[PDB]
Amino acid sequence: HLTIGFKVENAHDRILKTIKTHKLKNYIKESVNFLNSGLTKTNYLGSSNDNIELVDFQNIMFYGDAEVGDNQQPFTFILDTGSANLWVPSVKCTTAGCLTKHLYDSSKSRTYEKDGTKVEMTVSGFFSKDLVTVGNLSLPYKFIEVIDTNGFEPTYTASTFDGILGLGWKDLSIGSVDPIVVELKNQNKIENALFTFYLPVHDKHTGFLTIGGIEERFYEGPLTYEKLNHDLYWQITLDAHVGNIMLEKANCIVDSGTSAITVPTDFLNKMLQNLDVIKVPFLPFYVTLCNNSKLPTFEFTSENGKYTLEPEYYLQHIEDVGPGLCMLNIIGLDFPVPTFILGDPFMRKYFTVFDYDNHSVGIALAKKNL
Questions:
Q1: Which of 193, 216, 239 is the last residue of a domain?
Q2: Catalytic residue at 266?
Q3: Which residues are on the Lumenal side of the membrane?
């Protein structure tokens, strides 16, 4: 089966960059010493005003060997488990931001076939068909040529990728085109409409996407499959237990695109109550002494399995800020219903299979040493 490697830029990465750029080292250190000293009645964990935005905890997965058409420049694609389509910036996009990207030029591709169906996901573009290549897999595929990123401009211009490769579910609002993994199976180029993620526990800046099959070398024992509880998301139902508090049948979104385990703000506040963890005021992260022995273990259970996530998996040293200090890859994020995003930290412990044909997520302990 085809396995491709990708690089990861996580929340920790951007936090370090910010701290370095604006010399925030002492601010954080002094903030922690003061707030984690006990002078305050309770340990500050943020507020409605001083919160953490999900965008701050994006786990960007870059892949640079994808090809779209021929006679083109190389492209940098990021994986998005939440999008059904392949998005590629068009040579027709001529804003300052687009001119800093590698653009797709259909007039130069021999294999290009016109479609032209408009797309308004704001973002403007149209469908085009061309040979898309990922690894040793190539197939004529319908993707979206973007001509305007409208308000997305700043974020996009500041980013370091060109397009987005969707690993999510077909959403008729944008189109009736199947996601690339599904299309590959439709064209009998892969054995199964499924993909897997193996995120080496020892290297947070790396990840491996396998398309079309399940490689035994990535996990221990038999897989346990959890049925998706939604038609458009890699979301399953699990009871969450953390310390003496729990959330029954919470929606858990499995997403390698999120750098943390996200938890409802109220639940997080109760979890961290007097555990010597503090939110750095006005900075996107919680900090605590790496040796903190009060940190909880996440426990997620279903009718077929039990998955746990110990502190080692959500802690990351921020030695440059202060000795023995760790940031938590946990953030408070509310959804209309009790929801957890089982991001990167969860996937560093567990190998995951995303099965389109069977509408489920397969889980098994990941092999730490391949």
A1: 216
A2: no
A3: 122-370
